[PDB]
Amino acid sequence: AEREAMLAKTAADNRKSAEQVAAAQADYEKEMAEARAQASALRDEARAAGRSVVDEK
Amino acid sequence: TLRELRGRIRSAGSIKKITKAQELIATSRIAKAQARVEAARPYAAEITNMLTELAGASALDHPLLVERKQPKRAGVLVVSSDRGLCGAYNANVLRRAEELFSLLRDEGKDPVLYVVGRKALGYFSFRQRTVVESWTGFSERPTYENAREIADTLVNAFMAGADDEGDDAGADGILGVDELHIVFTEFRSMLSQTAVARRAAPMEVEYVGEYSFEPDPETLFDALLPRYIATRVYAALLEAAASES
Amino acid sequence: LADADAMHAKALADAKAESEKVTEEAKQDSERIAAQLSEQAGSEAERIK
Amino acid sequence: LDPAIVGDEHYRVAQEVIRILQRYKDLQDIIAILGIDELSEEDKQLVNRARRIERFLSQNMMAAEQFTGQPGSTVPLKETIEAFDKLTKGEFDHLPEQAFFLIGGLDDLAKKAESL
Amino acid sequence: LDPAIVGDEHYRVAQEVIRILQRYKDLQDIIAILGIDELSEEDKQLVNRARRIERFLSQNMMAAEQFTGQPGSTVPLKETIEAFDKLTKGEFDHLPEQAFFLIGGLDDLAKKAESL
Amino acid sequence: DGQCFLESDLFNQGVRPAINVGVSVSRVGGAAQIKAMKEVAGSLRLDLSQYRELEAFAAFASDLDAASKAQLDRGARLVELLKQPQYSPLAVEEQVVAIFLGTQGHLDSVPVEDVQRFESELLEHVKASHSDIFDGIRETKKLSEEAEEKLVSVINEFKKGFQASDGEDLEKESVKVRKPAP
Amino acid sequence: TGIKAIDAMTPIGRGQRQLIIGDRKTGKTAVCVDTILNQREAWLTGDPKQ
Ligand SMILES: Nc1ncnc2c1ncn2[C@@H]1O[C@H](COP(=O)(O)OP(=O)(O)OP(=O)(O)O)[C@@H](O)[C@H]1O
Numbered sequence: 038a039e040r041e042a043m044l045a046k047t048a049a050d051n052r053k054s055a056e057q058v059a060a061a062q063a064d065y066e067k068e069m070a071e072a073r074a075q076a077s078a079l080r081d082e083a084r085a086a087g088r089s090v091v092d093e094k
Numbered sequence: 095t096l097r098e099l100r101g102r103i104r105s106a107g108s109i110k111k112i113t114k115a116q117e118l119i120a121t122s123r124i125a126k127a128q129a130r131v132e133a134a135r136p137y138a139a140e141i142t143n144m145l146t147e148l149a150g151a152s153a154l155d156h157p158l159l160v161e162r163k164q165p166k167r168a169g170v171l172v173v174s175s176d177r178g179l180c181g182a183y184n185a186n187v188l189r190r191a192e193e194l195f196s197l198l199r200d201e202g203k204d205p206v207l208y209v210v211g212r213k214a215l216g217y218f219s220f221r222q223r224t225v226v227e228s229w230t231g232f233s234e235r236p237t238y239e240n241a242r243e244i245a246d247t248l249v250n251a252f253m254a255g256a257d258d259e260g261d262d263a264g265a266d267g268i269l270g271v272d273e274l275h276i277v278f279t280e281f282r283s284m285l286s287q288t289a290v291a292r293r294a295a296p297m298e299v300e301y302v303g304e305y306s307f308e309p310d311p312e313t314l315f316d317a318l319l320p321r322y323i324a325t326r327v328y329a330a331l332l333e334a335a336a337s338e339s
Numbered sequence: 340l341a342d343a344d345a346m347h348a349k350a351l352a353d354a355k356a357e358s359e360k361v362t363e364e365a366k367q368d369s370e371r372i373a374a375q376l377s378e379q380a381g382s383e384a385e386r387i388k
Numbered sequence: 389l390d391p392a393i394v395g396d397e398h399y400r401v402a403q404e405v406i407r408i409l410q411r412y413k414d415l416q417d418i419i420a421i422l423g424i425d426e427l428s429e430e431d432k433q434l435v436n437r438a439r440r441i442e443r444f445l446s447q448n449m450m451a452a453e454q455f456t457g458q459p460g461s462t463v464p465l466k467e468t469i470e471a472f473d474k475l476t477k478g479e480f481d482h483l484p485e486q487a488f489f490l491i492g493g494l495d496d497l498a499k500k501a502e503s504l
Numbered sequence: 505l506d507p508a509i510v511g512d513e514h515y516r517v518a519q520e521v522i523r524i525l526q527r528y529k530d531l532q533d534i535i536a537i538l539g540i541d542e543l544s545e546e547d548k549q550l551v552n553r554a555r556r557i558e559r560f561l562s563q564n565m566m567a568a569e570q571f572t573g574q575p576g577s578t579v580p581l582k583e584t585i586e587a588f589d590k591l592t593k594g595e596f597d598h599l600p601e602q603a604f605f606l607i608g609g610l611d612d613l614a615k616k617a618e619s620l
Numbered sequence: 621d622g623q624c625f626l627e628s629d630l631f632n633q634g635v636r637p638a639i640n641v642g643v644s645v646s647r648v649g650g651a652a653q654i655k656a657m658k659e660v661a662g663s664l665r666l667d668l669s670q671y672r673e674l675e676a677f678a679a680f681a682s683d684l685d686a687a688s689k690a691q692l693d694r695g696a697r698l699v700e701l702l703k704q705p706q707y708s709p710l711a712v713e714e715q716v717v718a719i720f721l722g723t724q725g726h727l728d729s730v731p732v733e734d735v736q737r738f739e740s741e742l743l744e745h746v747k748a749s750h751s752d753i754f755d756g757i758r759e760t761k762k763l764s765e766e767a768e769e770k771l772v773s774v775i776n777e778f779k780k781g782f783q784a785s786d787g788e789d790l791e792k793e794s795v796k797v798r799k800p801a802p
Numbered sequence: 803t804g805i806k807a808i809d810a811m812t813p814i815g816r817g818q819r820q821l822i823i824g825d826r827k828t829g830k831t832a833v834c835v836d837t838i839l840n841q842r843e844a845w846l847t848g849d850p851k852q
């Protein structure tokens with residue numbers, strides 16, 4: 038009864054490495070994409086607002 | 095203008111001449127394909143006679159003979175060529191495959207497919223459809239090894255669906271198919287060529303009405319059936335190539 | 340299992356650094372383009388005068 | 389140009405290159421539209437040979453120094469005869485397409501082959 | 505026609521329509537002899553789209569009242585641009601071709617298509 | 621001493637300048653343009669010419685090898701790079717930077733559909749960071765190895781940071797049994 | 803010149819003649835307009851040599 042847990046933990050450990058590294062990489066990609074998108078957006082809308090206020094003045 | 099007209103005239107003339115030349119290439123290869131295709135008849139006739147004689151005095155029970163009691167899924171294999179300029183041949187293959195898929199969709203079964211050839215592989219790559227495995231590079235000239243390995247793969251896939259209940263793979267450990275189909279083209283005549291799709295996964299027996307076995311009859315039977323399947327698969331290829339040319 | 344929870348701090352730290360740097364760059368280029376367009380507006384105002 | 393006062397080596401050099409170029413012009417539009425896949429084995433090998441010859445004929449000139457930074461080169465006659473015989477008999481069909489463009493000499497060809 | 509005077513969507517849609525029509529005109533020479541069998545699907549899709557759009561450019565003006573005996577129609581520009589964007593998207597490709605002859609708006613398009 | 625040919629077919633294709641590089645030529649050569657331009661760019665017209673010739677020649681080829689596919693990709697990147705919209709004045713330093721990044725194959729990773737925008741992005745970042753390199757050009761009219769290394773490091777860091785936004789009639793087969801039907 | 807294609811393709815040096823030929827609706831006036839507007843930055847500095 039001390040050997041089935043052996044294969045169970047071996048199988049869990051063999052895949053947990055890949056699962057965790059994939060999760061970390063996906064989270065990094067999502068956060069960097071969100072940051073770049075928000076910064077680029079902010080830039081475009083700020084340029085549009087400046088264009089509009091310059092037109093008004 | 096003048097230069098454009100002269101260039102187009104020379105272009106079209108040479109195009110015409112070499113289209114005739116490639117037509118001659120096809121005509122020349124037609125004779126070789128026709129000579130090669132009819133060389134496997136005696137082996138198939140002998141093996142079919144052997145199977146008839148053996149199954150006459152044997153028990154009728156086998157996984158490839160018995161049917162799955164439930165309609166889970168159905169496999170299919172599609173063949174094609176390895177060169178273009180074939181006209182509507184590949185279009186005919188795609189229409190027949192799509193119509194067979196439509197007929198099978200009436201039962202709601204999710205089917206699986208296998209492909210042979212670059213053209214069909216690319217066409218299905220462009221579309222949103224899954225592919226298990228592809229074979230390419232021998233449609234111009236096949237052998238027995240590829241047919242044998244394809245038959246082995248199909249047989250193992252069919253056997254791996256013994257106890258696939260629901261989504262459970264059971265003791266098989268992998269989801270297995272329950273039905274197989276083959277779509278190809280037949281050489282009716284020099285100008286008559288049509289696509290034929292047929293089902294040959296589960297054997298069926300018909301009694302038309304009306305020796306000694308050194309080894310075990312069932313051993314001979316289950317050693318025999320895979321050879322028959324492989325021979326059918328091999329016989330399909332040369333027919334397909336001849337119709338293509 | 341002990342090693343599993345090491346890189347998450349790095350991920351959070353780099354996410355924070357990326358966020359602050361991109362906000363800084365957006366602020367800087369926004370103010371610069373606004374100032375340049377305002378200067379062009381002043382130039383054209385002088386031109387129309 | 390005649391075998392009367394010049395060796396016939398030059399003569400069949402010229403005949404080989406000229407017939408190669410003529411049939412290449414014949415098959416040009418076919419390889420352009422129909423596709424290289426339909427040509428025969430002899431025609432495919434000949435078309436490759438004609439491409440090799442066409443690429444090898446170009447050569448830099450020192451008067452192009454103000455236009456291109458690569459300095460020009462000069463080659464004698466006998467070595468060119470030997471190199472063309474080697475090309476037209478069909479031993480240099482393994483070189484890449486770019487390896488035959490803007491070549492000083494045979495040793496320059498070897499150096500550029502070793503550069504790729 | 506200029507983006508400084510016209511909306512960006514109008515400019516982009518016009519440019520895309522011109523590009524598609526120009527590509528079809530370019531391939532018209534080759535398709536004239538062989539057809540569609542040799543042509544790949546990646547161009548068959550644009551061929552179908554181009555045929556559908558160039559058939560959609562037709563219209564039934566009032567001026568034909570004494571020739572075909574049918575009333576004409578008028579369309580606001582916003583409806584025109586939105587319909588052309590939808591058509592360029594490829595949503596309408598499943599509909600039959602002969603449904604796009606002499607039609608006024610997209611609602612009449614749908615009604616005629618469903619009527620057959 | 622030199623002329624440029626323009627055609628409407630290229631205009632409708634999408635190339636806004638719509639200049640045909642196959643025929644256009646200048647007899648004065650590169651002696652007029654700056655030395656840094658000559659060092660950075662050379663025989664580009666040739667490379668585009670073999671690219672166009674190869675595209676016309678192998679439009680219907682059944683099989684392509686690695687060299688041909690690589691040349692096709694490179695020429696596609698270059699031909700899409702050179703396009704410029706109307707009313708877009710530019711300085712010489714930005715032009716030489718764009719040509720330098722295009723020619724060295726650093727942009728081969730990005731798919732075609734985003735090759736343009738990415739360029740317009742990077743020109744902005746260099747404006748605020750490491751701007752003095754531009755300054756150097758203005759007083760050198762040439763590139764230095766240290767400045768080139770700084771530029772390549774900066775573009776590598778940016779491309780590491782940057783992300784890509786794209787990417788019945790059925791027959792049966794049976795067996796005959798002589799045994800009478802049960 | 804402002805357009806990168808011309809300078810990268812066929813450089814223009816002072817004292818040299820260049821020809822522009824094309825059909826209608828091509829945009830050949832745009833190149834001249836671009837060059838003329840580009841000259842302003844050069845004329846910003848007061849040196850007669852520029
Ligand atoms: N880079 C560009 N991108 C997009 N549109 C452009 C570009 N350059 C020019 N155009 C447009 O192309 C058209 C060219 O107009 P233009 O008056 O220059 O024509 P032309 O062919 O020189 O003929 P002409 O002077 O005889 O009237 C205009 O509509 C202009 O806005």
Ligand SMILES: [Mg+2]
Pocket residue numbers: 827828829830831832
């Ligand atoms: Mg004009």
